[PDB]
């Protein structure tokens, strides 16, 4: 009577924990829902996977959640929240390590 | 499921009664442990086997000297049910290069630096 349910595990979750050096483009975490939200220098794919937009150190923090004003469901949640309440979410940041570049003496004209 | 055991911290907080019983002052703690494997690693988890090998306690009843520092203590906490830990005592102080060849570890845990094998 019970058919299906044979799907395998998605192997989703965190691929880079805090303190891990991460190069640009590396996938930090794969998730089905928004468990960890994108922080600074962390981009979201179509499938909610978080990838490092810069080369640096991954840091997980708890930050206040301010949804985009056009995100109707989140805006309604906020509109129903009691005064003084603040939502928090776990964000993943990539603290860039290297500088954008250096000025080098190329020619002594 | 059987898993690695997290020993609560309060277990390793000695009391004045323990100090009186075992003869160790909380101030001025001993520097080195003498550790002897008194239990087989067989029928114990692979992690305990590996910790024993790390500590170099493969042979039973063979004393080994270890630092009394937090990391070594963590390993000893992991494998504490297989070993006997005693404080290394140095009645004549640390052996010197001159007497390095005349030392002996008496069963009391004292590293005597003169071993004459003669009656007192």
């Amino acid at each position: 009577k019970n058919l299906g349910g044979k799907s395998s595990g998605r192997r989703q979750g965190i691929k880079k924990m805090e303190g891990h050096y991460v190069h640009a483009g590396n996938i930090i975490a794969t998730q089905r829902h928004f468990r960890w939200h994108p922080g600074a220098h962390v981009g979201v794919g179509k499938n909610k996977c978080l990838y490092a937009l810069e080369e640096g150190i991954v840091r997980y923090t708890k930050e206040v959640y301010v949804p985009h004003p056009r995100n109707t469901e989140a805006v309604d949640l906020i509109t129903r929240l009691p005064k003084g309440a603040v939502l928090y979410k776990t964000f993943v940041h990539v603290v860039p390590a290297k500088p954008e570049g250096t000025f080098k003496l190329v020619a002594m004209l | 499921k059987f898993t690695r055991s997290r020993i609560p911290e309060k277990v390793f907080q000695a009391s004045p009664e323990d100090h009186e019983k075992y003869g160790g002052d909380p101030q001025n703690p001993h520097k080195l442990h003498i550790v002897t494997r008194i239990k087989s690693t067989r029928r114990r988890p692979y992690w305990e086997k590996d910790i024993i090998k790390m500590l170099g306690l493969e042979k039973a009843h063979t004393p080994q000297v270890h630092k009394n520092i937090p990391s070594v203590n963590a390993k000893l906490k992991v494998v504490k049910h297989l070993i006997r830990i005693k404080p290394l005592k140095l009645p004549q102080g640390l052996p010197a290069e001159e007497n390095m060849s005349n030392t002996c570890l008496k069963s009391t845990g004292e590293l005597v630096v003169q071993w004459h094998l003669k009656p007192v």
């Binding site: 009577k1 | 059987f2 898993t3 055991s5 020993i7 609560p8 049910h81």
Partner: protein
């Protein structure tokens, strides 16, 4: 309505989804209905087990017949059977899917009160039939007053305080001395050796 209320065989809205036999609901100390409420006497469960509609009927009939309605009142401290137990057809080989829902039970954990009685009466007037019911219950049970329950709890505390044994199950299990956690269960770190399956050892300290 002092007399004990009737308990239905199964919930009016029968459950449709078969669910596993999570024996943890019987295992361990009871965390609910552990204290008296609007009553002075009760049946305390000194062990875990499942109560069927047959047990409920036994309790109801015995207590209703033996009580004095004008001076005593009784009240259930355990919900009506809700957990569905499924049985396969007799002589069926293993496999082929989970069996159909056969009966409904209500779990009971050690230390819980099954029925609670009160009114213008003392213990001796009630302890008789309460002990009858407790003895006929599927788990170890005892007719206990508020005073007797407090006395037994205080006696357990006194034994725990004054035991001369340097070694306690709690200490050894928590410290993992001798590596006995290889032989113990994670539940034992909280049961402290007083519980073994559905059985509660009261003399155990």
């Amino acid at each position: 309505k002092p007399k004990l209320r009737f308990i239905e065989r199964a919930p009016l809205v029968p459950k449709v989804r078969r669910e596993p036999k999570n024996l943890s609901d019987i295992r361990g100390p009871s965390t609910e209905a552990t204290e008296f409420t609007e009553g002075n006497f009760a049946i305390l469960a000194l062990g875990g087990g499942y109560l069927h509609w047959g047990h409920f009927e036994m309790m109801r009939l015995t207590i209703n017949r033996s009580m004095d309605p004008k001076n005593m009142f009784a009240i259930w401290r355990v919900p009506a059977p809700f957990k569905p137990i499924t049985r396969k057809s007799v002589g069926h080989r293993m496999g082929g899917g989970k069996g159909a829902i056969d009966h409904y039970v209500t779990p009971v954990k050690a230390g819980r009160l099954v029925v609670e009685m009160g009114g213008r009466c003392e213990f001796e007037e009630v302890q008789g039939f309460l002990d009858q019911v407790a003895h006929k219950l599927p788990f170890a049970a005892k007719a206990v007053s508020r005073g007797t329950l407090e006395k037994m709890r205080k006696d357990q505390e006194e034994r725990e305080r004054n035991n001369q044994n340097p070694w306690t199950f709690e200490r050894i299990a928590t410290a993992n001395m001798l590596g006995i956690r290889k032989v113990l269960s994670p539940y034992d770190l909280t049961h402290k050796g007083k519980y073994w399956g559905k059985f509660y050892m009261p003399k155990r300290v």
